[PDB]
Symmetry: C2
Subunit: 115 residues, 2 copies
Amino acid sequence: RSIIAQDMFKTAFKGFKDGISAKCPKDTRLYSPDIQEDCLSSALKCTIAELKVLEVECNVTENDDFMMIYEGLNKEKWNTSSSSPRNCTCELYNQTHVKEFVENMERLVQLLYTR
Amino acid sequence: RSIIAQDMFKTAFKGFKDGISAKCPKDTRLYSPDIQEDCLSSALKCTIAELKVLEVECNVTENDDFMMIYEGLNKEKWNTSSSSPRNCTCELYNQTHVKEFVENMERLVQLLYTR
């Protein structure tokens, strides 16, 4: 596991998670992927699309943490492999508020480094 | 291959190798370990050790780039292993000017991310 990258994601997820809520409409709801073994690659494509959604509806400019999280998600090469990979649709995930969206985003990124 | 960490090195190396020379005495010299297959581990410890000799020779006691470089090396877990490993001696390497030192250093980190 690349400790250098997990450490930047740690700093970036702490600074980004703290300012949000108050930076977004309470009415903002985002699709929040889980860590089901056979859909991690879907789960990552959906986390990325909805970060974009979080962009256009939130006062997140120009967050150093946000564009670190975002560009990190698109360039890092994760092990998204399993016995039986499947496709999952973004809109079939739960919506939730911003605080739990990145929280779940963190948990997913950690899982990916764990393997 | 951890593209997030490699890009943080790349930028930190470019934003340092290009500023340096100007930031050190023209007569500064450093021992520059190379990438012999069986001396990777040594080569790492001497690189870190001459970073310190460069920390008092020049400014760089601060510097976002220098700290990221230095901290990356002591905390990232490397595959420095071989079938016939050997203990190299830092002062048995070639001494070089500060800019070439960081170039070789960039070459040693690229190699260890390739394996």
